[PDB]
Amino acid sequence: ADEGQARKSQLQRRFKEFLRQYRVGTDRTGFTFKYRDELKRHYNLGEYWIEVEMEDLASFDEDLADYLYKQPAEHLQLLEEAAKEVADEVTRPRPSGEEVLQDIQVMLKSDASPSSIRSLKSDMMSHLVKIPGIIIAASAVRAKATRISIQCRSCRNTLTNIAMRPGLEGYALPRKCCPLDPYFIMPDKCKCVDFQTLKLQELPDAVPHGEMPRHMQLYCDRYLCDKVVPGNRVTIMGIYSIKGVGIRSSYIRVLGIQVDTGAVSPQEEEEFRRLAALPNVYEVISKSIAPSIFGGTDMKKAIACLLFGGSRKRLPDGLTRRGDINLLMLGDPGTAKSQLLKFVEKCSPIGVYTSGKGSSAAGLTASVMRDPSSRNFIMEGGAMVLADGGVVCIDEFDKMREDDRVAIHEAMEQQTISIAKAGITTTLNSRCSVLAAANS
């Protein structure tokens, strides 16, 4: 309808003005245009993305922010189109070989408070939501169509530039120009993009006593691919929507990702250079390690050396030397052994904590099992694979069985795991430190 087209056009103009007029600063110093400059610098580097902030847009015009909160699917595409046409006038004219205009992805960010998965009343269908949690499963990458062309089997008529919806929903072809299923897709004319799927787990402290944790399904697209891995704690922003006779599944379409925990800024390098320069840094670091635990200064010093580690080497005749360090603590009960392990797992950039009594050989190194889909055998990584490059804390170390402690002799020295089972033979990496505690 023409009224709908007029409304779309008007809203697109308002988004465009927000991008090309917004400024920060004071007249006592000077003003800068926040989003124009970012579009220019990102386009000239071959990026094609920007990260708009809801707080800013809400301040420039409350109505636009309101619409983009209640009707995100309908309005976000107007914003993406606006960003594209601004990028053009901000960069044009481009050199030879650059004359064709590319498409921009717009990501969203905000300062407001999260809500738990359990808070999602079904009144929230298609509304914009912000959720925290842990990633527990992650797919490999696939190709997804954005626009296609098709041709007729019997009489070779065609239809072209057929638009495909984003998210986890499909499409159906026409039957006119013939047989009942007359058209087929042309793969050479498919404009495809990367896409991936994930599963999210509700936070351990948010779930009450006497209930299950809820879990949720996520869709991931273009520049967001391979940004995270399982076990990480993250904050997600996205659209919430649907995918006995009346049951239907549901999932979230992600629009922005923040890892609750990136490249170091220049300022941060200056501070680290200062820390490296000042003369008694060894004692400073030693006092930072496990500050609540009384005494044990030598033990804290040894732990510091474990976290920094030696250096890896490759020799001229092709052999390797391991570089990293293994440490064992043995003796009396009630002496804070378990507390130190519990700290080092949080202090290290990569770390895992497991109990010797509650673990198996196939669980420590790696395992082989049949795929729940298809019928094929597939590989799985144990604790010493997930902690590759980091520290592994083995608690209750003296309570493993003999045949299970035997399983880690390759991993602790040669830093690799050799497997030969079920008709598959491969070698995996495990470049990690072992920290262990035991009794007499």
């Binding site: 609540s292 009960p333 904590y353 990584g381």
Partner: protein, 576 residues
């Protein structure tokens, strides 16, 4: 008159305009006029509590509905899907009359019935019961995820319940049924729960059954209306609870009310009381968590009521588990891995210490476990987690429970010529994880024998089927659940010099006799006991009296560890 059933089925009758309006007015008037025995309005309070917390769900009791408006109580189980609809329509306008702005929060309110008298066993359902309101019991075994269902969309979840183990006959097999949970009932349960379920019995066609049996046989399911396990305190409850705290002798009343039929044994009752209320967990500076719970161990001669105390604790507390010696395995205590029946993948499931969570885990014949099974509880008792790495799984689970255990001395009888460690045969990493340690012994005083025997004979004539005064057990149960949920003691200051001096002296003597080794854990234990005594008095801040009580309990239980000839000198050394 509404009762005039003529020429129509009740389903048709309540569909008629006249009867529908009479039912509507009668339930509305019942809501506004219903009074308790004190002359208090019941539903004014209940509706106001519902509105203040935004909960959108109203519970009604069948017994007093019947007592005041029997005609509606008579129709209700015969046509539930009709009367429950009318009831919902009537309740929403009472809510809006009292709280005119409440339509901003919700546009519907659900009435849920309770204490329905006509309970049925889960294998005695027949076609006689179809499309009527029923009540049953069982344990949940399967439970889907919460999913959205068309209507607008609302939450939906499906479960499977079966007969409670030990209510089936020996060596035979249990029956089971499916049930459906909608809207605010989802996540009212999880696997392994035992529940009481009220709902509508309903049936539908299924081609698979007809082709499997060869006869036109239908499938059935239960629509849930109210679910409850087998706080909601009134103003009168909190008023009586708080008023009781004024009594300067409240400690005697609470202690004397534990396992009332057991004569004597003051120390055991006191220790169990402190463990029942518990200290408070904390994490100073965010990087240094420490547990709140107080663990207990009992040891001594046979025939001294050790097994009986655990059974009482199981009855009075909530979220309780009981297990014995050789009857438990390491994997059953902590957590286990399996090939899932229908998802066809490896999955991890909870054992005893995980299933108990913020509850009590009771162990008996602790002397007779296999040592490889007994060493499984070391992480859960101190770090309060269970960490597992098996079959590609790598994860950790919460284990926030209190452990209580009973054991026997070596050779069947305790010898006062030997210390506790010499008589019990448990290693130091186990012994040091229990906050309170007790020793129980036979005695041979004739007057004590006569009093005990006379009391037992009196107990037998008292319970035929037919110190200060203790509380009724229901009052005590209300008291405990209030104190654990509404009071959180703060340790704002205490005398560091006094405790430090005493601890150093105590540890020095512990080195001399070697009855038990004394470690950093003992100080933290006294802090827990001090907070527990503060909680029994319903006080928000710890005071000097609490610290003195904690020190007394600690030292009194320590002196018993020594040889008989040494105890006199030790007692005079630690004069308090």
């Amino acid at each position: 008159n509404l009762e005039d059933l003529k020429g129509h089925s009740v389903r048709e009758w309540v569909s008629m305009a006249g009867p529908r309006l009479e039912i509507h007015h009668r339930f509305k008037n019942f809501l506004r006029t219903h009074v308790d025995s004190h002359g208090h309005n019941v539903f004014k309070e209940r509706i106001s509590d519902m509105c203040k917390e935004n909960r959108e769900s109203l519970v009604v009791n069948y017994e007093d509905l019947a007592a005041r408006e029997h005609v509606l109580a008579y129709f209700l189980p015969e046509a539930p899907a009709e009367l429950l609809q009318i009831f919902d329509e009537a309740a929403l306008e009472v809510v809006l009359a009292m709280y005119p702005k409440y339509d901003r929060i919700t546009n519907h309110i659900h009435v849920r019935i309770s204490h329905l008298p006509l309970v049925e066993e889960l294998r005695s359902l027949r076609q006689l019961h179809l499309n009527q309101l029923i009540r049953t019991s069982g344990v949940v075994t399967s439970c889907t995820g919460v999913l959205p269902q068309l209507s607008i969309y609302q939450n939906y979840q499906r479960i499977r319940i079966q007969e409670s183990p030990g209510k089936v006959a020996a060596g035979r097999l249990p029956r089971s049924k499916d049930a459906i949970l909608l809207a605010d009932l989802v996540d009212s349960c999880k696997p392994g729960d035992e529940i009481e379920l009220t709902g509508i019995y309903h049936n539908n066609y299924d081609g698979s059954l007809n082709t499997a049996n060869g006869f036109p046989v239908f499938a059935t399911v239960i629509l849930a209306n109210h679910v409850a396990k087998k706080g909601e305190l009134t103003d009168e409850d909190v008023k009586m609870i708080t008023s009781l705290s004024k009594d300067q002798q409240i400690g005697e009343k609470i202690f004397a009310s534990i396992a009332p039929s057991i004569y004597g044994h003051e120390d055991i009752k006191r220790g169990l009381a402190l463990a029942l209320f518990g200290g408070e967990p904390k994490n100073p500076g965010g990087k240094h968590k420490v547990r709140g719970d107080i663990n207990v161990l009992l040891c001594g001669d046979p025939g001294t009521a050790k097994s009986q105390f655990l059974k009482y604790i199981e009855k009075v507390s909530s979220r309780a588990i009981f297990t014995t010696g050789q009857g438990a395995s390491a994997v059953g205590l902590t957590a286990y891995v399996q090939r899932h029946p229908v998802s066809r993948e490896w999955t991890l499931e909870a054992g005893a210490l995980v299933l108990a969570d913020r509850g009590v885990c009771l162990i008996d014949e602790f002397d007779k476990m296999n040592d490889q099974d007994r060493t499984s509880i070391h992480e859960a008792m101190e770090q309060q987690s269970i960490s597992i790495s098996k079959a590609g799984i790598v994860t950790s689970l919460q284990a926030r429970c209190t452990v209580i255990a009973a054991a026997n001395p070596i050779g069947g009888r305790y010898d006062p010529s030997l210390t506790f460690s010499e008589n019990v045969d448990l290693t130091e990493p186990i012994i040091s994880r229990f906050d309170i340690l007790c020793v129980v012994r036979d005695t041979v005083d004739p007057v004590q024998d006569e009093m005990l025997a006379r009391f037992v004979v009196g107990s037998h004539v008292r319970h035929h089927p037919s110190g200060v005064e203790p509380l009724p057990q229901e009052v005590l149960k209300k008291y405990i659940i209030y104190a654990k949920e509404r009071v959180h003691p703060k340790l704002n200051q205490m005398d560091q010099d006094k405790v430090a001096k005493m601890y150093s002296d105590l540890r020095k003597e512990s080195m001399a006799t070697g009855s038990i080794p004394i470690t950093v854990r003992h100080i933290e234990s006294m802090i827990r006991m001090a907070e527990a005594h503060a909680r029994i008095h319903l006080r928000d801040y710890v005071i000097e009296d609490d610290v003195n009580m904690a020190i007394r309990v600690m030292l009194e239980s320590f002196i018993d560890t020594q040889k008989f000839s040494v105890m006199r000198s030790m007692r005079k050394t630690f004069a308090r």
